Ligand binder design. Structure first.
Ligand SMILES: Cc1cc2c(cc1C)N(C[C@H](O)[C@H](O)[C@H](O)COP(=O)(O)OP(=O)(O)OC[C@H]1O[C@@H](n3cnc4c(N)ncnc43)[C@H](O)[C@@H]1O)c1[nH]c(=O)[nH]c(=O)c1N2
Length: 452
């Protein structure tokens, strides 16, 4: 067959893949990006389309303008199980036309020198001499089966992880996803009969009965258009998520017009720490495939762009030394952990706590205000549950007369602090990965026992 040689091969054109191609362009590298979907359908994976504005500023990513921005978000309303307590969290964000913005990032990168092939599926990985040296692509637009050699393969195939799962199991980069370390989510976009009250505010509904292990959401894309859905923890035995959706839709969205359904669908969402290593010999993994999603609120489009940013930095550093080994691309792990990875690991522990709280615990926790707004987003933006804040919350929990998991809040905050420092002390060399990984597991396996 035909053989082509590129510097970098990016597999997947979503938020992770496109951001990687954007940050890498115009810097002396021959780059190729592929995606199984047609160009007009790239990035149409079922999503809440809600991304913080801060992610666009930090990474130097272009703001979503025009049709790419459906609605401006100024805050989030958090609802208690009994609907009696409603917390208000402020912060600027964007309700996106995800495919429209994702395609502009691609098009701009294409104008900067990056070659893009749509309707192209990475089938077989090229693994020779213990290194990832490219992939066998199938462009069904031209019905060609091309063999593309590359120094570094960027894996951004989404949650499906279709490429890196075909690599040898001896590679640490082939770490799989445990069923309980992920959530299944489903969403629909409908038009509303009445105008949406506070359409600049996202609504998030907490309920372990209507959405066990996750939550319901109500994301206005306009004055009369809303993204409504839910998410539940997988590997627990729960019935189909569509049953939960169909049963409790009217409770969280009675104003929707069910005859004006625009889109519908769902997908798997990783809710854990990132891959222990997101880079190995001739390969970097980013996005859902590298488990980049915030374990608490399930937002992984912002962190995907972060992983792509760190992928670009690591690759440029690799070519700067002529080293495409794991030790050469190791800045990918260092960059991402400091940027978002260390936060994930901490929230990974906090997630396991929140998923095991009853509705009575959540109702009590919100009404009695165990934590204020000043400390809440301080936890979901930095991953830090300060020991001073945990003490102030425990003094409130001490006024509870019934047995509850809430009484272990201080122990949780200490475990989060421990695993936080453990991730900030990420192994400098791949030779220390094995030892560090087993230490992390010991923290997690111990914490899982402490919740019983
Ligand atoms: C229902 C629901 C709701 C939400 C969310 C998820 C879900 C399922 N998320 C998470 C968010 O959708 C997700 O984490 C990001 O899109 C991750 O970006 P990726 O590009 O890695 O994924 P994505 O899945 O978009 O990337 C995969 C891409 O690669 C392509 N591909 C796959 N295999 C391939 C192969 N072998 N060869 C070539 N191409 C291949 C696919 O076709 C696709 O285009 C979210 N996030 C957030 O921050 N805010 C939110 O509000 C939500 N809400």
């Amino acid at each position: 067959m035909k053989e082509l040689k590129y510097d970098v091969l990016i597999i997947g054109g979503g938020f992770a893949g496109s951001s990687a191609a954007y940050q890498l362009s115009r810097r002396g590298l021959k780059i190729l990006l592929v995606d199984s979907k047609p160009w007009n359908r790239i990035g149409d994976k079922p999503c809440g389309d809600a991304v913080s504005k801060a992610h666009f500023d930090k990474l130097g990513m272009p703001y979503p303008k025009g049709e790419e921005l459906e609605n401006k978000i100024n805050g989030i309303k958090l609802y208690s199980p009994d609907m009696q307590t409603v917390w208000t969290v402020n912060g600027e964000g964007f309700e996106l036309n995800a495919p429209l913005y994702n395609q502009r990032v691609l098009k701009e990168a294409q104008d900067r020198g990056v070659e893009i092939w749509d309707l192209t599926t990475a089938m077989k990985p090229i693994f020779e001499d213990g290194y990832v040296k490219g992939a066998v692509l199938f462009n069904r637009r031209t019905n060609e089966e091309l063999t593309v050699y590359s120094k570094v393969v960027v894996e951004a195939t989404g949650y499906s992880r279709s490429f890196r799962s075909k690599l040898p199991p001896e590679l640490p980069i082939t770490e799989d996803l445990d069923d309980k370390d992920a959530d299944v989510a489903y969403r629909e976009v409908l038009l509303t009969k009445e105008d949406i009250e506070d359409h600049d505010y996202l609504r998030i509904f907490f309920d372990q009965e209507t959405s066990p292990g996750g939550y319901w959401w109500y994301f206005p894309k306009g004055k009369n258009k809303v993204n409504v859905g839910l998410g539940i923890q997988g590997g627990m035995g729960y019935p189909s998520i569509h049953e939960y959706y169909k049963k409790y839709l009217d409770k969280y969205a009675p104003d929707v017009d069910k005859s004006k359904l625009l889109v519908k669908g769902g997908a798997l969402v990783p809710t854990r720490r990132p891959l222990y290593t997101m880079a190995w010999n001739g390969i970097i993994v980013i996005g859902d495939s590298g488990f980049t999603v915030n374990p608490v609120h399930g937002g992984g489009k912002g962190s995907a762009m972060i992983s792509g940013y760190c992928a670009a930095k690591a690759i440029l550093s690799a070519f700067e030394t002529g080293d495409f080994s794991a030790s050469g691309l190791w800045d990918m792990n260092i960059c991402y952990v400091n940027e978002y990875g260390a936060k994930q690991a901490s929230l990974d522990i906090f997630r396991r706590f929140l998923q095991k709280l009853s509705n009575d615990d959540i109702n009590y926790g919100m009404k009695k205000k165990i934590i204020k707004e000043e400390d809440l987003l301080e936890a979901s933006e930095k991953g830090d549950l300060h020991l001073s804040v945990a003490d102030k919350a425990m003094r409130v929990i001490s006024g509870l007369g019934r047995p509850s998991l809430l009484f272990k809040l201080k122990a949780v905050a200490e475990s989060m602090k421990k695993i936080k420092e453990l991730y900030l002390n990420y192994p400098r060399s791949p030779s220390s990965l094995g030892s560090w990984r087993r230490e992390v597991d010991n923290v997690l396996t111990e914490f899982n026992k402490s919740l019983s």
